[PDB]
Design an enzyme around this catalytic site. Structure first.
Site, PDB file in Angstrom:
ATOM      1  N   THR A 150       0.796  -1.228   0.000  1.00 42.53           N
ATOM      2  CA  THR A 150       0.000   0.000   0.000  1.00 42.53           C
ATOM      3  C   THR A 150       0.828   1.276   0.000  1.00 42.53           C
ATOM      4  OG1 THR A 150      -0.163  -0.099   2.429  1.00 42.53           O
ATOM      5  CG2 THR A 150      -2.026  -0.948   1.154  1.00 42.53           C
ATOM      6  N   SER A 151       0.199   2.357  -0.461  1.00 44.21           N
ATOM      7  CA  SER A 151       0.809   3.681  -0.488  1.00 44.21           C
ATOM      8  C   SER A 151       0.881   4.154   0.953  1.00 44.21           C
ATOM      9  CB  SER A 151      -0.017   4.642  -1.337  1.00 44.21           C
ATOM     10  OG  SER A 151       0.101   4.295  -2.704  1.00 44.21           O
ATOM     11  N   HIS A 191       7.898   0.345   4.162  1.00 45.17           N
ATOM     12  CA  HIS A 191       7.243  -0.834   4.708  1.00 45.17           C
ATOM     13  C   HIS A 191       8.410  -1.699   5.172  1.00 45.17           C
ATOM     14  CE1 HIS A 191       3.005  -0.553   3.737  1.00 45.17           C
ATOM     15  NE2 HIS A 191       3.279  -0.192   2.498  1.00 45.17           N
ATOM     16  N   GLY A 192       8.131  -2.623   6.079  1.00 42.42           N
ATOM     17  CA  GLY A 192       9.184  -3.493   6.549  1.00 42.42           C
ATOM     18  C   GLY A 192       8.694  -4.697   7.308  1.00 42.42           C
ATOM     19  N   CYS A 219       7.635  -1.418   9.775  1.00 42.70           N
ATOM     20  CA  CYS A 219       7.178  -2.503  10.634  1.00 42.70           C
ATOM     21  C   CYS A 219       8.293  -3.511  10.840  1.00 42.70           C
ATOM     22  CB  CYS A 219       5.964  -3.192  10.038  1.00 42.70           C
ATOM     23  SG  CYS A 219       4.501  -2.160  10.087  1.00 42.70           S
TER      24      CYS A 219
END
Lengths: 244, 4
Positions: free
Chosen positions: A34-35, A93-94, A135
């Site tokens: 996601t953006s 993100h992660g 994350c």
């Protein structure tokens, strides 16, 4: 001359150093990611905060996994002799030990290895700070109501990893205000960078994220959740952004 | 509020 103490890092070099901000907002459709609405607020807040701390800020937006590795390699190959430290902020993100490029993942170890004491000689003995907003898994914090042998240094020494969340946990980002961690980090650096040591500033960030924020969601699984950052220090000296 |  008089008695000399060396308990704090030398931060009076001609330059404070580079502050590389990798802001990944839009991801390739095929990744299914996601953006990251609100990350724009984070990147702008960080740019201003580190500019005020006299860092040479370089903002990079929407980088692929290949571009992140190339950027980190090139930056580590620069001459940092006249620089006091190095700062790298990762907004993406992660998962645990992973940060996402726009087209796929990059191991955090691959990024940080370029700056090892043996691989980036002009940064040896200098603080290398990695601020990570991503994350580290999928856990949610529900919260609770209140013989002698005598010239080498470790290659992993002088690194500081300021993680936005605890190992195994999700990290929260508000679409309008930006992330909980970066909002708090910038606020605490603006108020205390000329007064307190870095670990003490980061401890205030831990308190801010822990007390002032709680998630709001129409989905019961994601509602009323809390977050605590994670300060990981391999630093060998105290770090003050100011000098005498 | 969203997660990364």
């Amino acid at each position: 001359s008089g008695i000399s103490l060396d308990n704090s890092y030398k931060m009076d070099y001609p330059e404070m150093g580079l502050c590389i901000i990798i802001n990944n907002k839009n991801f390739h459709k095929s990744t299914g990611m996601t953006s990251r609405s609100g990350t724009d607020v984070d990147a702008a807040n960080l740019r201003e905060t580190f500019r005020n701390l006299k860092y040479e800020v370089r903002n990079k937006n929407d980088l692929t996994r290949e571009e992140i590795v190339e950027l980190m390699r090139d930056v580590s190959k620069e001459d940092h002799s006249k620089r006091s430290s190095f700062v790298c902020v990762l907004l993406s993100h992660g998962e645990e030990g992973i940060i996402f490029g726009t087209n796929g993942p990059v191991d955090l170890k691959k990024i940080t290895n370029f700056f090892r004491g043996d691989r980036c000689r002009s940064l040896t003995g200098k603080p290398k700070l990695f601020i990570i907003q991503a994350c580290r898994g999928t856990e949610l914090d529900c919260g609770i109501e209140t013989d002698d042998d005598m010239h080498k240094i470790p290659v992993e020494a002088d690194f500081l990893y300021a993680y936005s969340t605890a190992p195994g946990y999700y990290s929260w980002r508000n679409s309008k205000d930006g992330s909980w961690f970066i909002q708090s980090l910038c606020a605490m650096l603006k108020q205390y960078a000329d007064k307190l040591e870095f670990m003490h500033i980061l401890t205030r960030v831990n308190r801010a994220v822990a007390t002032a924020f709680e998630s709001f969601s129409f989905d019961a699984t994601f509602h009323a959740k809390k977050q605590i950052p994670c300060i990981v220090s391999m630093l060998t000296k105290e770090l003050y952004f100011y000098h005498h | 509020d969203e997660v990364d």
